[PDB]
Design an enzyme around this catalytic site. Structure first.
Site, mmCIF file in Angstrom:
data_model
loop_
_atom_site.group_PDB
_atom_site.id
_atom_site.type_symbol
_atom_site.label_atom_id
_atom_site.label_comp_id
_atom_site.label_asym_id
_atom_site.label_seq_id
_atom_site.Cartn_x
_atom_site.Cartn_y
_atom_site.Cartn_z
ATOM 1 N N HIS A 286 12.467 11.645 -39.849
ATOM 2 C CA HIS A 286 13.868 10.703 -40.500
ATOM 3 C C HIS A 286 13.953 9.375 -40.257
ATOM 4 C CE1 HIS A 286 16.618 10.760 -37.266
ATOM 5 N NE2 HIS A 286 16.476 11.952 -36.810
ATOM 6 N N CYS B 293 17.902 10.229 -30.993
ATOM 7 C CA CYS B 293 16.799 11.100 -31.680
ATOM 8 C C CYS B 293 15.533 10.673 -30.926
ATOM 9 C CB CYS B 293 17.054 10.859 -33.049
ATOM 10 S SG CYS B 293 18.611 11.439 -33.816
ATOM 11 N N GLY C 214 21.648 7.211 -31.531
ATOM 12 C CA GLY C 214 20.176 6.417 -30.802
ATOM 13 C C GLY C 214 19.430 7.299 -29.954
HETATM 14 O O1 LIG Z 1 22.907 13.916 -36.040
HETATM 15 C C1 LIG Z 1 22.518 12.981 -36.574
HETATM 16 N N1 LIG Z 1 22.818 11.598 -36.239
HETATM 17 C C2 LIG Z 1 22.573 10.378 -36.653
HETATM 18 C C3 LIG Z 1 23.353 9.977 -37.965
HETATM 19 C C4 LIG Z 1 22.635 8.564 -38.436
HETATM 20 O O2 LIG Z 1 21.485 9.278 -39.319
HETATM 21 C C5 LIG Z 1 20.622 8.491 -39.943
HETATM 22 C C6 LIG Z 1 19.351 8.505 -40.080
HETATM 23 C C7 LIG Z 1 18.211 7.695 -41.017
HETATM 24 C C8 LIG Z 1 18.833 6.445 -40.834
HETATM 25 C C9 LIG Z 1 20.090 6.002 -40.752
HETATM 26 C C10 LIG Z 1 21.014 6.878 -40.160
HETATM 27 C C11 LIG Z 1 23.965 11.543 -35.041
HETATM 28 C C12 LIG Z 1 23.601 12.167 -33.734
HETATM 29 C C13 LIG Z 1 24.498 12.312 -32.639
HETATM 30 C C14 LIG Z 1 23.711 13.092 -31.481
HETATM 31 N N2 LIG Z 1 22.353 13.238 -31.679
HETATM 32 S S1 LIG Z 1 22.109 12.729 -33.468
HETATM 33 N N3 LIG Z 1 21.552 12.942 -37.789
HETATM 34 C C15 LIG Z 1 20.344 12.094 -37.501
HETATM 35 C C16 LIG Z 1 19.424 12.924 -38.195
HETATM 36 C C17 LIG Z 1 20.029 14.220 -38.722
HETATM 37 C C18 LIG Z 1 19.723 14.963 -39.869
HETATM 38 F F1 LIG Z 1 18.406 15.257 -40.242
HETATM 39 C C19 LIG Z 1 20.610 15.993 -40.272
HETATM 40 C C20 LIG Z 1 22.226 15.815 -39.632
HETATM 41 C C21 LIG Z 1 22.464 14.752 -38.991
HETATM 42 C C22 LIG Z 1 21.540 14.054 -38.518
#
Ligand SMILES: O=C(N(CCCOc1ccccc1)Cc1ccns1)N1CCc2c(F)cccc21
Ligand SMILES: O=C(N(CCCOc1ccccc1)Cc1ccns1)N1CCc2c(F)cccc21
Lengths: 303, 302
Positions: free
Chosen positions: B41, B145, B143
């Site tokens: 991703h 991931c 940040g």
């Molecule tokens: O949960 C997260 N994020 C990142 C959000 C931003 O995602 C992005 C991703 C790409 C570009 C800009 C932004 C927050 C986190 C908190 C603690 N650990 S990760 N993500 C990133 C990946 C993802 C999925 F594939 C499905 C659902 C949620 C998420």
């Protein structure tokens, strides 16, 4: 999200762990530059431990009576001295993996990471607090002496603890890296016991601020308290006195959450009175006191 | 003496952490030999994340779309490919600190250490279990991931987890290092939820054996149960079924303590019903299920 007891990454310390042997006694030492630091009781037999005279035991030793192993490699000892309860062995090779470091003495309530080691080989890492009674609730078996506690800030390792002994209740006592014990303990088999311990109030308040930051407010109430009334109540539950210094240290967390320190104090008073009523706070069914204000800030979202 | 949630020393893994940037998206990667592994991703914008076509998004990328930073040093990307939900970036420099390693997929109930990282910089280490619902109860902010989970045996790092996402309840989901998710999750920002979780029964029993070894004995009893009656209780309280395999794995601790597993089950059965009678076990006011039988043996006898 989430909230875990988190240790510092241990690699900078791993590269400093060695095995020290004197006679049949082996334990861990810390190799920084051209010095190995270890507990002086390495020079004792079990018999010596009741009433050791370390000056008399040490004068009988030559450099070659100390065997220091760094992985597969024997380090040659070319000097020794004792500083308080720590033995310092000068070796002929400076550790090429020495990190930026300092030696610091911590105060009760402060946290640190422990790298538990056996035979100079790191086994595991965990987080500890210096308890008010100057013990730590670690996990240590025979062979662990000389394992160290530390914090890391930027790339600088602050060493604050070296393991020396287990007390009868199964808690642990040790020294700073200048060999001065935390608490009244001695490196002598005496009838020393941990004082009755107390809860680290400022840390519990920090952790309640963490719970708010992570989106939980169920435990707040409509009251406030004076600092004096708070201390009168909290001391009835064997909580440490909260000082104005502690109140000051909590200011940034108060500001981030909009909850005044004495309003969080009122919440804590009510939690001690009520229990959690089948709820948890950050996954715990008890009030956690081994996260500092700094540790909460370190780990939590600033949002 | 003492009993602590302990992580493996993280140094071998610290030396593998890098920062990977694609456009405005930065996260962590794992640098082993001349390949960097990270969540695919990274190639997505926030817009793309709603309904990504990864096949198309990767075809449109070239080597020059990727920046890899190892400390102060930029590594040049000279190849790229995807394996499941992991991006693989071939770089011009083999990591001189590559440990002996394997990629292993773990089972629910098994534990591992996590090195939590930000901008390719290790920040902290903790111990996790893979929950029965295939989530982990981690501690991760934006940040994180590409942060990894691992176990160490002798000198060999077994990498078992790479962080991909946070779920609405604040728990975490990711993949093995071959990019296969643990659990019924997808790398798209769409509605996803943790299944109702269940407690890892064999681990609770292991931890009760640990409590006995540490001289905490109050919950032992004369009275015992059957596997069938116990499992009826387990089912009521959202505990995983106890299998004969689990009973067998706990045999060492049964022998050491003189307490049969089904007697310890009756103890656990009473704790789930009658509760903990005000008391704590190893300083906990909950039944702890993130120590394996192996973890207890590792720490109590080792
Ligand atoms: O949960 C997260 N994020 C990142 C959000 C931003 O995602 C992005 C991703 C790409 C570009 C800009 C932004 C927050 C986190 C908190 C603690 N650990 S990760 N993500 C990133 C990946 C993802 C999925 F594939 C499905 C659902 C949620 C998420
Ligand atoms: O508590 C321990 N030991 C080692 C006992 C054998 O000591 C010795 C000592 C010398 C030679 C052979 C053997 C068990 C540990 C468990 C977990 N952490 S240390 N020690 C070692 C040092 C010490 C004191 F200075 C005073 C009271 C107790 C102890």
């Amino acid at each position: 999200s989430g909230f875990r007891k988190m240790a510092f990454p241990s690699g900078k310390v791993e590269g400093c762990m060695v095995q020290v042997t004197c006679g049949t006694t082996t334990l861990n030492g810390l190799w920084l530059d051209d010095v190995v630091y270890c507990p002086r009781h390495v020079i004792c037999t079990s018999e010596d431990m009741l009433n050791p005279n370390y000056e008399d035991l040490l004068i009988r030793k030559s450099n070659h009576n100390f065997l220091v192993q760094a992985g597969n490699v024997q380090l040659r000892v070319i000097g020794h001295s004792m500083q308080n309860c720590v033995l310092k062995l000068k070796v002929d090779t400076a550790n090429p993996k020495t990190p930026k470091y300092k030696f610091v003495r911590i105060q009760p309530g402060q946290t640190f990471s422990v790298l538990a080691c056996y035979n100079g080989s790191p086994s595991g890492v965990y987080q500890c607090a210096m308890r008010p009674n100057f013990t730590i609730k670690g996990s240590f078996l025979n062979g662990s002496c000389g394992s160290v506690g530390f914090n890391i800030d930027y790339d600088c390792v602050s060493f604050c603890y070296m393991h020396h002994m287990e007390l009868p209740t199964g808690v642990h006592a040790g020294t700073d890296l200048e060999g001065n014990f935390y608490g009244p303990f001695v490196d002598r088999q005496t009838a020393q016991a941990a004082g009755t311990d107390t809860t680290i109030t400022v840390n519990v308040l920090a952790w309640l601020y963490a719970a708010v930051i992570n989106g939980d407010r169920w435990f707040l109430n409509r009251f406030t308290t004076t600092l004096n009334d708070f201390n009168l109540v909290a001391m009835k539950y064997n909580y440490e006195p909260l000082t104005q210094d502690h109140v000051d240290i909590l200011g940034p967390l108060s500001a981030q959450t909009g909850i005044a320190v004495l309003d969080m104090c009122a919440s804590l008073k009510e939690l001690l009175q009520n229990g959690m009523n089948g709820r948890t706070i950050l996954g715990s069914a008890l009030l956690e006191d081994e996260f500092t204000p700094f540790d909460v800030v370190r780990q939590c979202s600033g949002v």
